[PDB]
């Protein structure tokens, strides 16, 4: 019968590893680097677009940074198509929680549920896992500003600063060097860009090859604002920090 053609996506290796999860992570390691840095008064999300072409429409484009609700956003590393499936699920889950409790969903709860879905694809169903790693940047009134990451295994962890995608080894070392706990958003912005600028496989880091976003309490009195940076705004912030 059909047994002959089954890859058996949800099995263990002799060493106790999940073949498909490991190979999915290998896929993600070639994806454009995405960085998240959490400050005391906000969060930064920075991501490098995959080898841009000059005729690509840059302003009306979305590849790396997606909005889940007003308080939570994600940076993507891996297959974009896979990520969008998960993003729509996450957006729906956030609205279900709001409908049920009349309160915006706590960041961890959203992250756990999305990570539980990924877990499912590694344990049952016989389907390939989602070739995607997320960086979740969000706020709620319990824990305040939070950074998380999830990967195809369905395992998630919390961070002060973290990178996913390509050159994470080099990127994590540079973040570990210059990061400190009393850091501000504007400082975190500068660290995020400096790290990408040194870990990039491109010749020079430019505005057209970047996606940038912040989550501050920079709105008027005790409320959170999401800023997805425009092309011109990235061009300005790149000049202001002295990279171009």
Partner 1 sequence: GYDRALSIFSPDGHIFQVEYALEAVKRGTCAVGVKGKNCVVLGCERRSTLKLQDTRITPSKVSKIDSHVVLSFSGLNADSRILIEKARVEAQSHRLTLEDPVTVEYLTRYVAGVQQRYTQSGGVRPFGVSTLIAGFDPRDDEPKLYQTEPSGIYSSWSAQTIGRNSKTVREFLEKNYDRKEPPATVEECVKLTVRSLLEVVQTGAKNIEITVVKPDSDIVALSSEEINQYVTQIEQEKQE
Partner 2 sequence: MDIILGIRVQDSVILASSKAVTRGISVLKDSDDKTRQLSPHTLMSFAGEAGDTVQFAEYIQANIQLYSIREDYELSPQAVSSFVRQELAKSIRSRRPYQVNVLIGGYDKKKNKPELYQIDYLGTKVELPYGAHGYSGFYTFSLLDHHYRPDMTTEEGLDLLKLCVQELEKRMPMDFKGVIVKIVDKDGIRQVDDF
Partner 3 sequence: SDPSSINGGIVVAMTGKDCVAIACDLRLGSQSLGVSNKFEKIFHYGHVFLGITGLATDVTTLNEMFRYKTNLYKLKEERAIEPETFTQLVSSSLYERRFGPYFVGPVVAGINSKSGKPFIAGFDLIGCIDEAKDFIVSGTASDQLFGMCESLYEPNLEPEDLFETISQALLNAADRDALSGWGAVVYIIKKDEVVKRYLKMRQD
Residue 235 CB, nearest approach to partner 1 (Å): 29
Quick one: which of 221, 198, 175 has its CA closest to 44? 175
| DSSP label of 181 | T
Quick one: how far is CA 5 from the chain centroid? Answer: 34
Q: By C-beta, is 18 or 237 nearer to partner 1?
A: 18
- Does residue number 89 form part of the binding site for partner 1 (CB under 8 A)? no
- Does residue number 227 form part of the binding site for partner 3 (CB under 8 A)? no
| DSSP label of 4 | G
Binding to partner 2 (CB under 8 A): which residues in 113-152? 141-142
Is 214 in contact with 67 (CB distance < 8 Å)?
no
Residue 25 to residue 5: CA distance in whole angstroms:
24
CA distances from residue 118 to 155, 204, 222 in whole angstroms, order as listed: 8, 35, 34
Two structure tokens written together for 139: 């706020």
Binding to partner 1 (CB under 8 A): which residues in 115-154? 115-116, 118-119, 122-127, 143, 146-148, 153-154
Q: By C-beta, is 50 or 91 nearer to partner 3?
A: 91
- Does residue number 59 form part of the binding site for partner 3 (CB under 8 A)? no
Among 7, 95, 157, 173, binds partner 3 (CB under 8 A): 95
- Does residue number 100 form part of the binding site for partner 2 (CB under 8 A)? yes
Residue 82 to residue 163: CA distance in whole angstroms:
19
Number of Cα atoms under 13 Å in the Cβ half of residue 220: 0
Number of Cα atoms under 13 Å in the Cβ half of residue 116: 9
Among 13, 102, 123, 203, binds partner 2 (CB under 8 A): 102
Q: For the chain, what is the radius of gyration of the CA atoms?
A: 18
- CA 127, 129, 131, 134 torsion-angle sign: positive
69 binds, among partner 1, partner 3, partner 2, none (CB under 5 to 8 A by kind): partner 3
Task: Give the binding range for partner 1 (CB under 8 A) out of 8-16, 56-64, 92-100, 200-208.
Answer: 8-16
- Does residue number 67 form part of the binding site for partner 3 (CB under 8 A)? yes
- Does residue number 103 form part of the binding site for partner 2 (CB under 8 A)? yes
Binding site for partner 1 (CB under 8 A): 3, 6, 8, 10-18, 38, 107-108, 112, 115-116, 118-119, 122-127, 143, 146-148, 153-162, 172, 175-176, 179
Residues that bind partner 3 (CB under 8 A): 67-69, 91-92, 95-96, 98-99, 102
């Amino acid at each position: 019968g059909s047994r002959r053609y089954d890859s058996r996506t949800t099995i263990f290796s002799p060493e106790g590893r999940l073949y498909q999860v490991e190979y999915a992570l290998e896929s993600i390691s070639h994806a454009g680097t995405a960085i998240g840095i959490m400050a005391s008064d906000g969060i930064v999300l920075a991501a490098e677009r995959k080898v841009t072409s000059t005729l690509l429409e840059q302003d009306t484009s979305t590849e790396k940074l997606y909005k889940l609700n007003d308080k939570i956003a994600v940076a993507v590393a891996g297959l974009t198509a896979d990520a969008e499936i998960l993003i729509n699920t996450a957006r729906i889950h956030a609205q279900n929680y709001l409908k049920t409790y009349n309160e915006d969903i706590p960041v961890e709860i959203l992250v756990r549920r999305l990570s539980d879905i990924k877990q499912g694809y590694t344990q049952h169903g016989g389907l390939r896992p989602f070739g995607v790693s997320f960086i979740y940047a969000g706020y709620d009134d319990r824990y305040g500003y939070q950074l998380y990451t999830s990967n195809p295994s369905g395992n998630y962890t919390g961070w002060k600063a973290i990178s996913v995608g390509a050159n994470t080894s080099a990127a994590q070392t540079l973040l570990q060097m210059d990061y400190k706990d009393d850091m501000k958003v504007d400082d975190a912005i500068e660290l995020a860009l400096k790290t990408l600028s040194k870990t990039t496989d491109s010749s020079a880091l430019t505005y057209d090859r970047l996606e940038f976003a912040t989550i501050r309490k920079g709105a008027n009195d005790g409320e959170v604002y999401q800023k997805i940076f425009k092309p011109q705004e990235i061009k300005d912030i790149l000049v202001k920090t002295g990279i171009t």
